[PDB]
Subunit: 260 residues, 4 copies
Amino acid sequence: MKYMITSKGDEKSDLLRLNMIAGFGEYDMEYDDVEPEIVISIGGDGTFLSAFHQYEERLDEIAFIGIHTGHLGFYADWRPAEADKLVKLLAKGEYQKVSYPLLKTTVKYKEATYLALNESTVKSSGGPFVVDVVINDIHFERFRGDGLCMSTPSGTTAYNKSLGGALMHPSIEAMQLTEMASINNRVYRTIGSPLVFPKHHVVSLQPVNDKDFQISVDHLSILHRDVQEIRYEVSAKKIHFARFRSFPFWRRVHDSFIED
Amino acid sequence: MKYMITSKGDEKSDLLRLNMIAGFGEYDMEYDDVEPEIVISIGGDGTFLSAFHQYEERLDEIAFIGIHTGHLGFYADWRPAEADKLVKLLAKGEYQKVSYPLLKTTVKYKEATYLALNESTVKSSGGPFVVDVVINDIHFERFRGDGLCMSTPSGTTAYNKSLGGALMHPSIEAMQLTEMASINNRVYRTIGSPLVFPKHHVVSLQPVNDKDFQISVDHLSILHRDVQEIRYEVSAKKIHFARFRSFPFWRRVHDSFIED
Amino acid sequence: MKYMITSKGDEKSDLLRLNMIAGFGEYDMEYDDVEPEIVISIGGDGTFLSAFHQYEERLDEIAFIGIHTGHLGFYADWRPAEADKLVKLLAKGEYQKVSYPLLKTTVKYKEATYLALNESTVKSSGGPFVVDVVINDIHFERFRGDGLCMSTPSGTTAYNKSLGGALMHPSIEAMQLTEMASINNRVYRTIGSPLVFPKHHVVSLQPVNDKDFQISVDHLSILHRDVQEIRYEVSAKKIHFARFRSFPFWRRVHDSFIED
Amino acid sequence: MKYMITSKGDEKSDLLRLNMIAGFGEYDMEYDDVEPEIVISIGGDGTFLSAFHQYEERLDEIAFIGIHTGHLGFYADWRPAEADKLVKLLAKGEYQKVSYPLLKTTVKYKEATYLALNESTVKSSGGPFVVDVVINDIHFERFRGDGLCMSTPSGTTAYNKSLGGALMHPSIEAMQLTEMASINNRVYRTIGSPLVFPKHHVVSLQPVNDKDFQISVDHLSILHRDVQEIRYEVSAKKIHFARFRSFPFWRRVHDSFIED
Ligand SMILES: [N-]=[N+]=NC[C@H]1O[C@@H](n2c(SCC(=O)NC[C@H]3O[C@@H](n4c(Br)nc5c(N)ncnc54)[C@H](O)[C@@H]3O)nc3c(N)ncnc32)[C@H](O)[C@@H]1O
Ligand SMILES: [N-]=[N+]=NC[C@H]1O[C@@H](n2c(SCC(=O)NC[C@H]3O[C@@H](n4c(Br)nc5c(N)ncnc54)[C@H](O)[C@@H]3O)nc3c(N)ncnc32)[C@H](O)[C@@H]1O
Ligand SMILES: [N-]=[N+]=NC[C@H]1O[C@@H](n2c(SCC(=O)NC[C@H]3O[C@@H](n4c(Br)nc5c(N)ncnc54)[C@H](O)[C@@H]3O)nc3c(N)ncnc32)[C@H](O)[C@@H]1O
Ligand SMILES: [N-]=[N+]=NC[C@H]1O[C@@H](n2c(SCC(=O)NC[C@H]3O[C@@H](n4c(Br)nc5c(N)ncnc54)[C@H](O)[C@@H]3O)nc3c(N)ncnc32)[C@H](O)[C@@H]1O
């Protein structure tokens, strides 16, 4: 089975990568970073993010594995000392697949589309941030403030969390929108609360004056000029994980935030 | 078709109720508050809550209608001046059904079960509130504070909202747990963020010292003594609404909180 | 110099108390719990609270000392192993005084007055909590929700903190009001933000319907019936601490919440 | 008495400015925008901000007046239709002075100092924002997130408010620090709560890796490279308002946020 391995780049991660490759050499496993069926990421959640985007064009043909070298990561839930056990199980195909929902972002000017594993956020180019929020073609509110964040289920433990958003189990096909320092006057009104949308619901952000926005997708952040619309919806695409043992999302949340 | 009508009790509501009954008299409609197929609530969301609990034993045989007399209610989304149009459509059966998820609460000592349309909350009898939160048999945290609130999707716009919870579209089969003034020390740790659970996930609250709790279910609030466990899960039962026109949840949220 | 010692009641605290008394016996120190000039509290912040209220009638003649036996307390900032050094310094009068502001609460029906070291809160007797907030005789808002909390500066690290309140340096003569799960509709409006008031500002809570309130003052909580007004203001009275070394408030905040 | 008038620039504001000048011509009043004793700002709070910074070098020789043309502003608390009454009172010197505290910001690389009427905030140049917070020379925390905001008392109703900060009466000489989307892990810890500092307390932000910061002061925002320290403290300088009638801060808060 074709596979590839990305690395954080530091000494610890590269040597672990080299050892796993040597181990894979003792099995019927072909290293291939062009069309792998298995992508192993060694490092943190930031390394896993990169691995995901590196292969976002063939998400349906890939099963991802995360190794943390590293504090306990949400995506990288494998200890380094378990690497040898890992190469074994991967070789004999003793694993099933677990899928998480993704977020689709469409920027219309032409138009560009992006896929997020964590979230996509929108900010202004420097001036004040003012946008109209439209839900399924119905004007919901005019948001004034620092920006808006639209998170996937697995992304709720990231940026979303810092903004007061709720943590959602990744078996729920939804996206969550949170506010960033909204102005609430006797003249300016936002909902304040995070909003959780189901599949097929479309949230559209529309410029009021300034048409330039700094739009981020996970770790990537690009300036978009002359934007007519930003469109959010639960993607039809999903990310597939290879799971060899039980590591429940809530236990992962506990170990990362409460006590490990 | 059998039907019944509850009223807020004030002059406006009772007279509207009497007029609708007279109108139903002009059709093949039998008033029956023992086995109605249609329950019409005239008043506010508090009146609708009562109507729901009054008939929670036959939820699968009933379609609910809410009339607000009344500011725009989340459950009571019919204007009084539309009552005559309402009686018409109900008579000719020109309506489909919309269902919302419900919350099941199980209190073990024996055990009692309750059904919530909005939420179920837990507080102490007076002393400090300390409970262990267990998710699917795994200890998640030890909560210290004022209490915990477990909300249905449609209930997220109620008490849940005041506690910083997210608003969830009621087509999502989930429950949301929020904290009430949790103590977060260098010794006491809670997740802080709201938690959204899917169907079949079980959240269990377990006493640490005091075994007495003030437990609320929607408008009802009873003291429970010698509690061994409080168990939350998305109910297998659902509430059924009769819908005659489009009134989207998000538009309802907008009209109630942003601008009507 | 007259002195007295209160104890948490457990083995550790009582024996420490007995040892300190024996140590004081080696100096010109008279034990007196009726008119002490020095009150030593051994236990936690809950024990210190009790010591304070036990002697709130002679606050200007007393210097308080807190010993934690015990995690690091905000009021009890002395390690048990430092007790012997403590008895020494207290005997030779090698200490200056540090004062913190207090909160005065006046309940009118007749009227009762209370003094708080941490905070005073107001809740309903069971029904909904609705009160008019009047600042210096000007109606500020009508609050609907679970309740209101008025905190002293040193109390801001307590209940106030759990409600989203700010931490205030105790050299600032002020009181801070925070909300408890306020309902914010398109019909019900509260400020949302905590409010910090200076000396001589008077905040008055006035019933709208229900005249019965559960009113707490620090650890004490009594039901008041037929209340006409609750009045908050920075007290003219202050609590006096005896300080032998530098232990800055912000360092105390750090050790309690960040890392000790 | 020397005076000057700034304007929002729109038709309404300029004509009001021209009329007031004509009115001042009927009295012993000399227009002078180089050394005015009275600065009148016509527009919004953004116009008042500009007027303040335009003359921040002679704050002790100036009394500011704000006219809103305009919704009710916090600094611009004069209705346009009251302009004629205003010119009268100003001419006869029938006014006393009210002073609000200011915030001093010192950026060391050399060093630059800035004065804020509302707040000063710090963000990263694009990468992650990581800084060490030092209070009076004692390391308090390592902040990871979007940024930090340090607000004056009168500024608490602005940006500070959107970040969950408390509203402080401007008679209190203090500054308030609030967080912007802080990361709180089991490895990263911030206080979370807003912090209110008194006069003479110094808060210092120190780079951990990236030494470049986008630093804002009210409406102004400049990038600073190779920063060694950002230092916050309550300024010795104060802004002076000319007051002709009672318009209490809390009433101003009410009219702006609750109901006008
Ligand atoms: N910057 N940053 N992130 C540091 C933390 O991000 C973590 N992380 C990561 S990836 C690490 C990384 O480099 N991430 C870039 C991410 O930082 C997040 N972020 C940003 Br941008 N601003 C943030 C902010 N202000 N607070 C918290 N997180 C923020 C946001 O999720 C963005 O995709 N993914 C998750 C996840 N799903 N759940 C919980 N944590 C996650 C890493 O473990 C690390 O601990
Ligand atoms: N108390 N109260 N509730 C007043 C508001 O509750 C509204 N309401 C109602 S029912 C009215 C009533 O009497 N409700 C009792 C409910 O009050 C809510 N509640 C409580 Br208890 N404490 C609250 C609090 N502190 N803040 C806000 N809501 C609170 C909680 O949802 C409880 O079930 N249902 C909803 C709903 N699903 N979404 C939004 N609003 C709802 C009514 O419209 C009314 O405006
Ligand atoms: N309940 N309780 N309190 C537990 C914590 O209170 C601490 N404490 C105490 S006293 C301990 C005690 O028994 N306190 C009763 C206090 O509990 C606080 N409280 C209440 Br009531 N409800 C709370 C809640 N929901 N969350 C946090 N604190 C709450 C409130 O301050 C009340 O006066 N004083 C302080 C203080 N000034 N700053 C920080 N912590 C303080 C103790 O150290 C203990 O860790
Ligand atoms: N951007 N903006 N501000 C719009 C509002 O700022 C108001 N304003 C102003 S000045 C208007 C303006 O142009 N201000 C620039 C200010 O915007 C504030 N600000 C920023 Br930057 N980001 C914000 C944000 N995300 N949310 C709220 N306010 C924000 C911040 O206070 C900054 O100094 N001062 C006050 C004040 N002291 N209290 C309350 N409101 C104030 C104006 O009335 C206007 O309604």
